[PDB]
Structures are given as C-alpha cells and as structure tokens.
C-alpha cells in the first residue's frame, strides 16, 4: 500500500504545516501537524477542556462505531517550546492520503496548554518519530508509520514541505518526480529516538563550504533551524544590523535586509536553502525588526533541522530494519 497528502502551511511564515487525517467511521477529518521530532497522534476533542477549545475541529469518539477506549491509558507530552498536552487513549481507523490503520491509538486530549488553544488551525500532531518516544502509559503505543510499515510497498515515509506553499507526505514510496537530482543517504542514530544524523558542514552565502560534524535531528514539526551559536554567529555576520536579542529571544535583523543562503552537508551532497526561508518576518506587527529563522541552539541541547532547512529539500526518512535520512535538492 501506499499514502499520499497534501500538508499546507499554517499561515504566511509557514510557522507549521497541516495535513488532512481521517480518524474513525464515518471519517472526521482533523488537519494535524506532521512531526517527525516527535511520537504520539494526538487531538482536540470532545473530552478536551471546553475553555481550552478556540476554533479547533474535534474529534468525538462516541460518533466513530470503530472506536474503542484503550482502557487504563494515559499520556502526557511537554514539548520542547514549552508546550503540553494530556488525556485518555482511544484505537480507532485512521487513513492518511488513502493509507489506512486499523487499531491506531488515538490520543484524546483532555488538557491543552494554551499555545495550542491558540491556534486554532492545528487539530492536533501526529508523531513520526521513533516509537519508544510515544509517552502512552502504562502500555507504549506504536506510531501510524510503525502500525503501517510492513503494509506498505517500501518502509519508508518522505517529507516534501513548500516554501509558501502547500507540499506533500508520501508513505511507502519515493516520488522521483519530485526532486532533482539524486538523493544522498546518511546514517541515522535512533538511541534517542529521534530521526538523528551528522550533517558534514555548512556554508554562508557564497563562503566556502566548512567541514565540520553537526549532529542533530530532522524535525517536520519545529519552524526553525537550531543549531550551533558558532555556526549561527557566522551566518548573521554576514547580515548588516543584525543582532541577538535577549529580550526578543534570538537573533533579529534589519527587515530591509537581503538575507544569504545558507547550505548544509549531507555526505558529499549539499543543500542550499534560499535567504528568503530565513526570514520570518517582524518581530511585532509594523515593526522594522525581523525574526531570523536561523537560531542558536546552545540552548536547547541537541541541533534541530527543522522546517527552515527541510523544505529546501525533498527528504527521505527510510524506515529499514536499519533506519537511514536521505537528502534531495528539488
Ligand atoms: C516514554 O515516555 C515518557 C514520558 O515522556 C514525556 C514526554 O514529554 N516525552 C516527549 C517530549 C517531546 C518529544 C517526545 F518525542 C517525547
């Protein structure tokens, strides 16, 4: 089997991308936030906390004939951003571009933290991390790829995330229309449980290539790219005006600014994402001050290519006995 969605930006900056998920029978369809960074498939819903909902479509369990409580389960995620949500487990059959799960657990929020409730275009997140990350207690679930694998043509999923435009979830193939070139593997580290890998080095604009290991993770659900505060200083020295602010929290620039590509190693391979994708426009309404989308990860503890630097690329996260990240220009 395979699957095919469409995933479409959030708003203008494409802080997230949502994708279109059918959970339950009759279907209700909820638009979730992909996340390769993460492994639980959670969602607003009836149980959720009334004050808490603002706009958000739900899912109802009790109008899904094939849902069923996954009795005594429990979850309780907190988000690298600070962010967190909990409740109760339901399995139920959730499709995604056509591929269908059986038996999924779905994850009924019955708290929300409020930068959820505040954005009312995200019905919940769907996890494609590793499943020894998913939180269900006290009996761990599997994610909808790990359910899906050994249905599909080929145990793998690709990311082909727009620049201010929707893009594209394929599971079970590898669309080789959608990329030019060829596509470069690199080894994946699952000891953490995430889709973890060593970019070989970096360039600023038109700089010469730095060879140099950055270890960090390929995650479809953070905006941003993190990673180190060397790294990231070179990159906005190159930036007249622009600065890191304490106050703001990260670096910011001059919005009259031409920002510099920035390109990442991938093997021998080299990806380059346009300055437009850095720029994530102001950091207040009518305000000259822009937000970088290239930001210090010292922080944080691990370096994060996240959206930024995903959707330069067509990316293939190879899901094999031995899991591997490969990289396509496009
Ligand atoms: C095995 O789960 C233990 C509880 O974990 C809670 C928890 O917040 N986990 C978590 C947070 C962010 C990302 C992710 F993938 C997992």
Same mark, same amino acid.
């Given at each position: 089997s395979t699957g095919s969605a469409t995933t479409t930006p959030i708003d203008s900056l494409d802080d997230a991308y949502i994708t279109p998920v059918q959970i339950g029978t009759p279907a209700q369809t909820l638009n979730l936030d992909f996340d390769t960074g993460s492994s639980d498939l959670w969602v607003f819903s009836s149980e959720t906390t009334a004050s808490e909902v603002d706009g958000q479509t739900i899912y109802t369990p009790s109008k899904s004939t094939t849902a069923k409580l996954l009795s005594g389960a429990t979850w309780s995620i907190s988000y690298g951003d600070g962010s967190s949500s909990?409740?109760?487990?339901?399995?139920?059959?959730?499709?995604?571009?056509?591929?269908?799960?059986?038996?999924?657990?779905?994850?009924?929020?019955?708290?929300?933290?409020?930068?959820?409730?505040?954005? $009312?275009?995200?019905?919940?997140?769907?996890?494609?991390?590793?499943?020894?990350?998913?939180?269900?207690?006290?009996?761990?679930?599997?994610?909808?790829?790990?359910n899906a694998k050994a249905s599909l043509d080929s145990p793998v999923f690709t990311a082909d995330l727009g620049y201010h435009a929707p893009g594209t979830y394929n599971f079970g193939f590898i669309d080789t229309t959608a990329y030019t070139?060829?596509?470069?593997?690199?080894?994946?580290?699952?000891?953490?449980?995430?889709?973890?890998?060593?970019?070989?080095?970096?360039?600023?604009?038109?700089?010469?290539?730095? $060879?140099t290991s950055i270890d960090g993770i390929a995650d479809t659900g953070t905006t941003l790219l993190y990673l180190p505060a060397t790294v990231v200083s070179a990159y906005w020295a190159q930036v007249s005006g622009a600065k890191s602010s304490s106050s703001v929290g990260?670096?910011?620039?001059?919005?009259?600014?031409?920002?510099? $590509?920035?390109?990442?190693?991938?093997?021998?391979?080299?990806?380059?994402?346009?300055?437009?994708?850095?720029?994530?426009?102001?950091?207040?309404?009518?305000?000259?001050?822009?937000?970088?989308?290239?930001?210090?990860?010292a922080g944080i503890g691990i370096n994060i290519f996240g959206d930024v630097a995903l959707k330069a690329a067509f990316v293939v996260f190879n899901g094999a006995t031995t899991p591997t990240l490969g990289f396509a220009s496009k």
């Amino acid at each position: 089997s395979t699957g095919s969605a469409t995933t479409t930006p959030i708003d203008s900056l494409d802080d997230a991308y949502i994708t279109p998920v059918q959970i339950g029978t009759p279907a209700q369809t909820l638009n979730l936030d992909f996340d390769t960074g993460s492994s639980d498939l959670w969602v607003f819903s009836s149980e959720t906390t009334a004050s808490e909902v603002d706009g958000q479509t739900i899912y109802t369990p009790s109008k899904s004939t094939t849902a069923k409580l996954l009795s005594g389960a429990t979850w309780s995620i907190s988000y690298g951003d600070g962010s967190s949500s909990s409740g109760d487990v339901y399995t139920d059959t959730v499709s995604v571009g056509g591929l269908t799960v059986t038996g999924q657990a779905v994850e009924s929020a019955k708290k929300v933290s409020s930068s959820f409730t505040e954005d $009312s275009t995200i019905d919940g997140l769907l996890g494609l991390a590793f499943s020894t990350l998913n939180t269900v207690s006290p009996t761990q679930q599997k994610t909808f790829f790990d359910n899906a694998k050994a249905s599909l043509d080929s145990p793998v999923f690709t990311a082909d995330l727009g620049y201010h435009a929707p893009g594209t979830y394929n599971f079970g193939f590898i669309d080789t229309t959608a990329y030019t070139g060829s596509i470069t593997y690199t080894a994946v580290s699952t000891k953490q449980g995430f889709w973890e890998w060593t970019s070989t080095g970096y360039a600023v604009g038109s700089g010469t290539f730095k $060879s140099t290991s950055i270890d960090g993770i390929a995650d479809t659900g953070t905006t941003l790219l993190y990673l180190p505060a060397t790294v990231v200083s070179a990159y906005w020295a190159q930036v007249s005006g622009a600065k890191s602010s304490s106050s703001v929290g990260g670096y910011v620039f001059p919005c009259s600014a031409t920002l510099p $590509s920035f390109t990442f190693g991938v093997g021998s391979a080299r990806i380059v994402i346009p300055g437009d994708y850095i720029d994530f426009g102001p950091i207040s309404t009518g305000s000259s001050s822009c937000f970088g989308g290239i930001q210090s990860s010292a922080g944080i503890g691990i370096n994060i290519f996240g959206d930024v630097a995903l959707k330069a690329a067509f990316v293939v996260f190879n899901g094999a006995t031995t899991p591997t990240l490969g990289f396509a220009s496009k």
